[PDB]
Design a binder for these strands. Structure first.
Ligand SMILES: [Mg+2]
Ligand SMILES: [Zn+2]
Ligand SMILES: [Zn+2]
Ligand SMILES: [Zn+2]
Length: 1190
DNA sequence: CCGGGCCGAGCCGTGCTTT
DNA sequence: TGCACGGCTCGGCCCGG
């Protein structure tokens, strides 16, 4: 099976997990906790997760064998059949069987990670068609959490319900027309008043869907809005069913393609209507002129990403505008899942709005990505204040020259993986000329002419190197260097021209200017001026002449200076002369044949076409495909704290005040009345909210109370009574409203842990669970002492943005080679022994690289855990850390905010960025996509000691974010489906570049380029992956977004508009400000309409009155009444809006809207705030009065 | 010396909508 | 995508009559 390294890796991981689990089990046995054992079982594959989460017991082996035999979908269907026939045990009525089968099937088809089977499916019930035939059918009730599951999960739930209804021998749902009207109205109102829904079903589609769904999709109410078609038969509510309508909109409708694919694979009949719906939904010119025409015909610009711009979030490029982001096909070391590659220079030169991990909304491949530094690609070309043009391909140069920038001519490159085009099914765009194409042409031409076999990006035999160098008359060392790293070693321009002359290949892409960005008439005028009024110095190299310098005066150059800037030619202006220096004089004069032939404009021809037709040295289009993007959602790395911060899960009520301070209530002697669980000692008879009796140190028993007669029974007594009151007749409850004196409890806790010096200790107003079991106060004291905070289930968590990585360097993460060899790494990614810190090593699937904020916080968490173990439990310390670098080799838990299972990872290094780097398999095993998502990490021992299932809220969305099970091993076969499209090749073949020019589809050449899916099953899914582009440093560049250092809204808008003004391909003046105004106008108009219909509230109480009390004071107390929508909330964005209107070009519609909004704001308060104040000076150059008087 | 003026934390509420 | 903005109270310190 697996080789002798992956097995050792997984064995060591299991050994460490066992080492932690032993201590966690030993500590929990002493009885100071809700349970006497750990409450997080460990799974290993999908069957274990499904068995632990939904059951029924014993299903694991059956799932295993069925998956081995048939597959995934077929195995799910056979499991459903076996459950229905009753192999795993008798359950009860048909409803129980239906619920169990649907839950297990939805868990199997999902791989048992996301909590849709546990949370979304609230209930399954059988209903009768009393309106038509009195026949039976099946219905599904969807709760609130189903909106977080995803379209695939929702659609698969619908399909599983259909299959179970078919196999139960039940009839079809037959809706009345009023049902259709009610559902259409529900969808429309939900979109209008709640959310955008990210999908708009047309009413015809909704009617068709209702007419052709064999099950009833309903549920409880999730929004406080009534409907019109009330009292519909079979419906027990008259409010919005958000879960059901969201399922219907974003499931079967938004993801019909995947649903019909699943139906075809699954062999399910009766869904032909969906298949039909899906199939209905589905002269002498120049080469480059025709290519541009076909590009514009087939692939069309998209504006969806730029339909809205928030104040403070800049737009970096208009849709498919030349001068924006240059598209490059490839995958870097730390990109590929859904992220982009960006040079740090263009991160700096946009006022540092972009930072490592900052999300942005893209146009072509998908929608959204995360930026990552790649120093191997090109940067911006900028125009300075004195008129010079520079190529800022370097980070330090960008820092140096930042203040002199006048305009950004070109914005730089963006590396996008080929697997991102396959996943989103996007037509391939023609590829800009690059070094990774030139090197392939070079080696192919060398082989064709001289019959020498060489290969880029690797090491070749010495005989071939010597033969090629003898033929080409070059240094063999330089040939080896260039073939090894074509992206960093470039020949001098004269050598490039000599290569083009001899071998017959286009010019090196580094020395090609953007010729096709100008018209041939501009080049005609420029050629005339160069021939007439220029002084050029020539040179020689192997009989090849080339220019060395051009000096032409500014007046003689005239208005053709703009042409030199559009070609991206670096020059300088001195004492009236424009000077073009050595490397960039031949880059301009060689294509034009050194003025030997006359450039002449032609119709239906492009500049490169004319150059190729007339010249001997040939060229390729260097910029033809451009991309647009827009900023959104800056990067994040911060701890998790509840809406009011909490340090212990202990209810205090109103005694503690506004901050729920337990210590303040204790020090004032207050007595609080709250609902808690009381425990009673069997031997002596102590009573109170504690798990151990202080008198004797023995475990107590929970007390059960009668809701009607308040009779208390111990757990042993209530066990026989079947948890029902014999004297009364009501089901018991474990909690009742009781009285507590905080002083005694706090003093006992302080004496217990010897922690007396704590200032504040926050609790909760009321426990949300059904048991209302409280937490020990000693844990709260230690958390307060060590400055950490608690979560809803008792764990301490840290939230960060996720980014991918496959290969690392021992110096980027600050780890010595000896430590790495101790961890288990012994070779670099090419087979050589690991001896240096500059070699590239490959990352094992479950190794993570934390940030430094995360390390700083986890140091406090580890200190708290050590204090807990030493003081509360009386056991030796575990971590023993004094610096963040002492946590290396310790295990964490990763958890997405919508799943119920975790995955174990290992710490190996730290970076100085606000992102969480990890393997692509690690992020996919949490059902995450890596284009803006944020997840959590917690120490394994902390979760083991602290997590409990008795602190979980009792509503439906209470089991989300909880590690009910953890996975110990990684299986790439059952992680996700988007990560199966990634690339594992060192370089793209020549066929890919040649096929991009034909505008093919990525499905045609899916076999040419190796992907992850091509390796599934075989042992080398963990073994060898590769990348295309290298990086000097993985965390180089700005680290914090500038958006987080601006306070006012006006300042944000001004900075964003300056940024938009600098960039050439944005066109701020009329679209940026207008689309921005369509973000402040909703705020203004929507706050004036809520001032005239608002509810009032009391300062002391929380009582809300829908109309003001007519005595002016709170009827139930003595406090005063305050508004909920103040007067200053309406007109907070009025000044910025007026500035935007008066400064920039907006259509008269928006200007009139703003003027009338101001007039309406000043007219509603006409007789409550009269203008009794005169003034000295008036007319501050306003715009409203000017518009009125004009 | 004893009484105010003032800051700095905290905790609440709110973000287009034809008849 | 949700966060970003306004307003009310309540002590802890100066600083002055
Ligand atoms: Mg995502
Ligand atoms: Zn006792
Ligand atoms: Zn009773
Ligand atoms: Zn009141």
């Amino acid at each position: 099976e697996l080789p002798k390294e992956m097995e050792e890796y997984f064995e060591m991981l299991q050994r460490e997990i066992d080492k932690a689990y032993e201590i966690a089990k030993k500590a929990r046995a002493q009885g100071k906790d809700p349970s006497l054992d750990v409450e997080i079982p460990q799974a290993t594959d999908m069957a274990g997760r499904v068995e632990s989460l939904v059951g029924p017991p014993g299903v694991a082996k059956r799932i295993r064998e069925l998956v081995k035999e048939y597959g995934k979908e077929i195995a799910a269907l056979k499991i459903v059949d076996e459950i229905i026939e009753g192999k795993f045990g008798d359950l009860g009525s048909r409803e129980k069987y239906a619920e169990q089968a649907v839950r297990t099937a939805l868990a199997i088809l999902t791989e048992g990670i996301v909590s849709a089977p546990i949370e979304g499916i609230a209930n399954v019930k059988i209903k009768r068609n009393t309106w038509a035939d009195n026949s039976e059918y099946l219905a599904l009730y969807y709760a609130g959490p189903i909106r977080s599951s995803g379209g695939t999960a929702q659609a698969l739930s619908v399909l599983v319900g259909d299959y179970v209804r078919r196999k139960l021998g039940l009839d079809r749902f037959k809706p009345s027309e009023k049902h259709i009207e009610r559902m259409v109205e529900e969808v429309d109102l939900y979109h209008r008043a709640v959310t955008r829904l990210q999908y708009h079903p047309s009413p015809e589609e909704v009617r068709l869907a209702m007419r052709n769904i064999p099950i009833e999709i309903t549920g409880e109410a999730t929004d406080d809005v009534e409907v019109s078609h009330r009292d519909v038969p079979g419906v027990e509510t008259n409010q919005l069913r958000g879960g059901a309508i969201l399922v219907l909109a974003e499931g079967v409708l938004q993801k019909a393609k995947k649903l019909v694919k699943y139906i075809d694979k699954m062999g399910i009949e009766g869904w032909e209507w969906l298949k039909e719906f899906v199939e209905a939904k589905e002269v002498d010119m120049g080469f480059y002129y025709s290519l541009y025409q076909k590009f514009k015909e087939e692939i069309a610009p998209s504006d969806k990403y730029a339909k809205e711009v928030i104040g403070g979030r800049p737009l970096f490029s208009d849709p498919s505008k030349p001068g924006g982001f240059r598209l490059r096909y490839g995958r870097s070391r730390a990109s590929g899942f859904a992220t982009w590659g960006i040079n740090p220079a263009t991160m700096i030169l946009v006022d540092e709005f972009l930072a490592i991990g900052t999300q942005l909304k893209t146009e072509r491949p998908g929608k959204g990505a995360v930026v990552t530094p790649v120093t191997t690609i090109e940067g911006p070309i900028v125009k300075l204040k004195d008129g010079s043009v520079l190529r800022v391909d370097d980070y330090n140069l960008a820092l140096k020259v930042r203040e002199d920038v006048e305009e950004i001519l070109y914005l730089g490159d963006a590396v996008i993986a080929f697997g991102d085009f396959v996943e989103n099914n996007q037509t391939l765009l023609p590829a800009n000329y690059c070094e990774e194409w030139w090197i392939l042409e070079f080696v192919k031409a060398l082989k064709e002419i001289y019959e020498v076999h060489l290969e880029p990006f690797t090491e070749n035999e010495e005989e071939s190197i010597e033969e090629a160098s003898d033929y080409l008359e070059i240094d063999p060392e330089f040939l080896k260097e260039m073939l090894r790293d074509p992206l960093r070693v470039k020949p001098p321009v004269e050598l490039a021209i000599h290569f083009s002359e001899v071998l017959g290949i286009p010019l090196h892409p580094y020395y090609t200017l953007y010729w096709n960005s100008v018209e041939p008439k501009d080049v005609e005028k420029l050629w005339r001026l160069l021939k007439n009024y220029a002084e050029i110095e020539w040179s020689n190299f192997r009989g090849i002449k080339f220019a060395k310098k051009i000096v032409i005066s500014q007046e003689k150059l005239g208005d053709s200076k703009r042409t030199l800037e559009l070609l991206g030619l670096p020059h300088t202006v001195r004492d009236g002369n424009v000077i073009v220096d050595y490397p960039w004089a031949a880059a301009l004069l060689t294509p034009l044949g050194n003025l030997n032939w006359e450039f002449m404009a032609k119709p239906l021809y492009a500049t490169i076409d004319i150059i190729n037709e007339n010249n001997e040295i040939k060229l390729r289009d260097r910029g033809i495909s451009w991309i647009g993007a827009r900023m959104g959602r800056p990067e994040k790395a911060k701890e998790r704290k509840m809406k009011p911060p909490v340090q212990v899960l202990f209810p205090i009520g109103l005694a503690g005040g506004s901050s729920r301070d337990i210590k303040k209530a204790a020090e004032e002697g207050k007595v609080a009345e709250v609902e808690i669980a009381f425990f009673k000692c069997p031997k002596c008879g102590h009573v109170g909210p504690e798990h151990l009796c202080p008198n004797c140190g023995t475990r107590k028993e929970l007390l059960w109370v009668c809701p009607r007669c308040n009779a208390e029974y111990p757990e042993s007594q209530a066990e026989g009574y079947n948890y029902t009151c014999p004297k009364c007749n009501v089901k018991l409850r474990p909690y009742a409203k009781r009285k507590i004196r905080p002083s005694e409890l706090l003093n006992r806790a302080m004496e217990n842990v010897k922690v007396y010096g704590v200032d504040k200790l926050k609790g909760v107003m009321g426990m949300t669970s059904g048991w209302k079991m409280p937490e020990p106060l000693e844990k709260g004291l230690l958390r307060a002492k060590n400055d950490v905070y608690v979560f809803k289930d008792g764990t301490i968590r840290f939230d960060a943005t996720d980014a991918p990585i496959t290969h690392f360097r021992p110096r980027e993460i600050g780890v010595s080679v000896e430590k790495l060899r101790e961890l288990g790494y012994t070779h670099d990614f090419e087979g050589k022994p690991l001896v240096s810190e500059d070699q590239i090593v490959e990352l094992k699937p479950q190794d993570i690289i934390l940030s430094k904020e995360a390390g700083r916080y986890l140091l406090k968490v580890a200190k708290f855990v050590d204090d807990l173990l030493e003081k509360f439990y009386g056991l030796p310390r575990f971590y023993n850390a004094e610096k963040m670098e002492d946590l290396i080799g310790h295990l964490v838990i990763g958890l997405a905010p919508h799943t119920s299972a975790g995955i174990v990872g290992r710490i190996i290094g730290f970076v100085d960025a606000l992102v969480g780097y990890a393997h692509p398999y690690f992020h996919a095993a949490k059902r995450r996509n890596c284009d803006g998502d944020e997840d959590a990490v917690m120490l394994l021992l902390d979760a083991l000691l602290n997590f409990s299932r008795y602190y979980l809220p009792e509503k439906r969305g209470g089991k989300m974010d909880a590690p009910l099970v953890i996975t110990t091993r990684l299986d790439p076969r059952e992680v996700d489906s988007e990560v199966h499209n990634m690339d594992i090749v060192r370089y793209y073949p020549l066929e890919f570049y040649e096929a991009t020019y034909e505008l093919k589809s990525p499905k045609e050449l899916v076999g040419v380029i190796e992907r992850v899916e091509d390796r599934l099953g075989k042992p080398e899914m963990y073994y060898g992956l590769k990348f295309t582009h290298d990086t000097d440093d993985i965390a180089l560049g700005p680290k914090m977004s500038l958006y987080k250092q601006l306070g006012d809204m006006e300042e944000k808008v001004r900075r964003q508009l300056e940024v938009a003004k600098r960039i050439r391909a944005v066109d701020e003046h009329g679209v940026a400000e207008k689309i921005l105004n369509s973000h402040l106008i909703p705020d203004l108009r929507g706050n004036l309409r809520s001032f005239t219909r608002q509810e009032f509230r009391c300062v002391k109480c929380n009582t809300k009155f829908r109309r003001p009390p007519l005595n002016g004071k709170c009827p139930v107390c003595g406090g005063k009444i305050v508004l909920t929508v103040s007067k200053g909330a309406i007109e907070k964005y009025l000044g910025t809006a007026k500035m935007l209107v008066t400064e920039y070009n907006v259509k008269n519609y928006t200007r009139q809207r703003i003027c009338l909004t101001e007039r309406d704001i000043d007219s509603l308060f006409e007789n409550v705030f009269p203008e009794t104040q005169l003034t000295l000076i008036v007319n501050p150059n306003d715009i409203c009065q000017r518009l009125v008087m004009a």
